[PDB]
A paper describes a structure:
To determine the molecular basis of the interaction between [name]–CT and Tu, we crystallized [name]–CT:CdiIEC869 in complex with Tu and determined the structure, as the [name]–CT:CdiIEC869 complex interacts more tightly with Tu than [name]–CT in vitro. In the structure of [name]–CT:CdiIEC869 in complex with Tu, the [name]–CT toxin interacts with domain II of Tu on one side and with [name] on the other side. The [name]–CT toxin domain consists of an N-terminal three-stranded anti-parallel β-sheet (β1- β3) and a C-terminal three-stranded anti-parallel β-sheet (β4 - β6). The overall structure of the [name]–CT toxin domain is topologically homologous to those of other [name] toxin domains from [name] 3006 ([name]–CTEC3006), [name] NC101 ([name]–CTNC101) and Klebsiella pneumoniae 342 ([name]–CTKp342) and adopts the Barnase/EndoU/Colicin/RelE (BECR) fold. Mutations His216 and His281 in [name]–CT reduced the toxic activity of [name]–CT in vivo, indicating that they are residues involved in catalysis and suggesting that [name] inhibits the activity of [name]–CT through masking the catalytic site of [name]–CT, thereby preventing the 3′-portion of [name] from binding to the catalytic pocket of [name]–CT. In this structure, Tu adopts the GDP-bound open form structure, although no GDP was bound to Tu. α3 of [name]–CT is sandwiched between the β-barrel of the domain II of Tu and the β-sheet of [name]–CT. [name]–CT extensively interacts with the domain II of Tu.
The [name]–CT of enterohemorrhagic [name] EC869 ([name]–CTEC869) cleaves the 3′-acceptor regions of specific tRNAs in a reaction that requires the translation factors Tu/Ts and GTP. [name] is an immunity protein that protects cells from self-intoxication by forming a tight [name]–CT:[name] complex.
Author numbering:
A (entry chain B): 175 to 285
B (entry chain A): 10 to 393
C (entry chain C): 3 to 179
Amino acid sequence: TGTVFDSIKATQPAIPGTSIPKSFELHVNGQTVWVNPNATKHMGEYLTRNGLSHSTAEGSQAMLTSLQSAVKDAFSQGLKFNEKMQVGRWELVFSQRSSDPYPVLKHALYK
Amino acid sequence: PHVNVGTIGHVDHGKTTLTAAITTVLAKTYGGAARAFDQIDNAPEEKARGITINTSHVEYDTPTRHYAHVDCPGHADYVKNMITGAAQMDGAILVVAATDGPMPQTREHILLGRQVGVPYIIVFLNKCDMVDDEELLELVEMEVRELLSQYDFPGDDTPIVRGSALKALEGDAEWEAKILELAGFLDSYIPEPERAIDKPFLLPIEDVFSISGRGTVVTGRVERGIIKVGEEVEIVGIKETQKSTCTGVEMFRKLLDEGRAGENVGVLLRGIKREEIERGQVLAKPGTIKPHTKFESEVYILSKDEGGRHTPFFKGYRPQFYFRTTDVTGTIELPEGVEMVMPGDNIKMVVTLIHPIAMDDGLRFAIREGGRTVGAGVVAKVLS
Amino acid sequence: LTVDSVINEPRSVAITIDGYIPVDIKIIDSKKLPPLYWRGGDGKKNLLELAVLPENGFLSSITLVMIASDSIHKTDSLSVSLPSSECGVPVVNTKLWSHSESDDFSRRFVDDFSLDIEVIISSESMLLTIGENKKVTSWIKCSDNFYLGIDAGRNVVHLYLDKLTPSEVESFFEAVG
């Protein structure tokens, strides 16, 4: 049993140069949130902009851990759908279509 | 037990003959040399990878150790091999022909070997058969020790063998015994190299993050030593050195309580703020690394075919120096009388940087200008 | 902002429309170096990001992530008056990011949220206005299905879309929320 990747179900291959998938079902405290590819686009942008570091796996794991600790704090205050979030150093927006019984996350920014 | 040794000396003084004789004679008197491949093919300061060093190699085996012996064919290859860390060495074998004394090239080579920090050097006098007097041998054996002592080597304690490689590989005894005593000095005088896991802990920072409810985590690969949970670590770099404690170590597959050198890990710190940590910094054992701005070093500038300048640079040169994880622009001071530094020749220079960086003697670095690697160097002496 | 040139590189621009993310246009697949962004609108309810390479002024993707049903206005039909200007991918003077070399994302995102955004949507086409300003200048035409418009004050103001069939505005309205 891993530390963080046990809460992630991968749905697409990894972003070029990282170990985070393009989209995944994140299981935080039982809530299943599917991550839209835009959040992962911005996370890979963060991890690649610093330059290729060749130790991107642990950085990606820590980034996913930070994202989970932010989404649990988003659940702590209640989810504001289609609105920017107030979690410190982050900002997330959610949505829920009728076909999806699980909410979707469309935006992830790490300042 | 695997030990790496190198040869230093003039090309036509018979160092290749010595290597062949050592291999064949130790293969006769002892077992055959093992084919083991224990070492990597490259060096620290990864941006300096791909300089196309020649690095002539041989291997032999003694009853106690297995020796990988390396030598360079030319001056440029030798200086590139010493300045970069390719084919690391725990000891060097100085080869001087007793017929004609040490050369200025050999003097410059052992000066470079001191600057890069070659720990021990033993001397082998070749072609001692082509001289019919023991006193001239005594005087040249004294002057090589004098030279070694001039360049801070223990010239008084340096083992010296008076042999002849050619007659040794021609099957004549009393010379096979001399190169066997050479191998015995390799076994006895050269200590076991310091294992990387036993060195002081040091970790270059590559990326920094903050996890809500958990704290700040740094993600880099550890270069030296071991780090365990609960220990206090000092971060040293651009800002003033700070203290923190490791409240856990995270790895890509499982969470572990100790981080050994060579592993890519994630270190959780205590009390430190994301804004205070940057990339160019390093975690270390408190008091084991110090930040410096000025240092004397020996550098090799890449030639045109190696990807460097097509033109020389001058006193007003201001490049970037890429250390473990970042570049820092620095200003250089050239030796007296040096008006220009062409591409392809090695030179000493005193570099002073714009921000402090944690450094010790022997740390290697790359020299870039616009993101392209243009030279390689190793710090010889830290300054104020 | 500052837009200063156009190019003529023929390459396919793909435009998908998910039921989650309203709109997204990908003119090129950028992997040489990630882009840097300009974010416009109201930061809380109406966010529109624009990406541009750091090496030059070429764009990567401009997409709005969320828009309010009140900040849009559906009308009967287009005012499709279109003076065709030079075609191709525009460029941007990247002086806004004076120090993009610190490698901290904070100094990489310039976003003036003081400017709001309106969307005029119809069963025929959709246009986007920014800044609540009465400025109009030449209209760059990236592809026959996607046009763009600059203002007199050195900035992109109006966006336009063509050849859209309501079968995907169904998903667009499922995503606008």
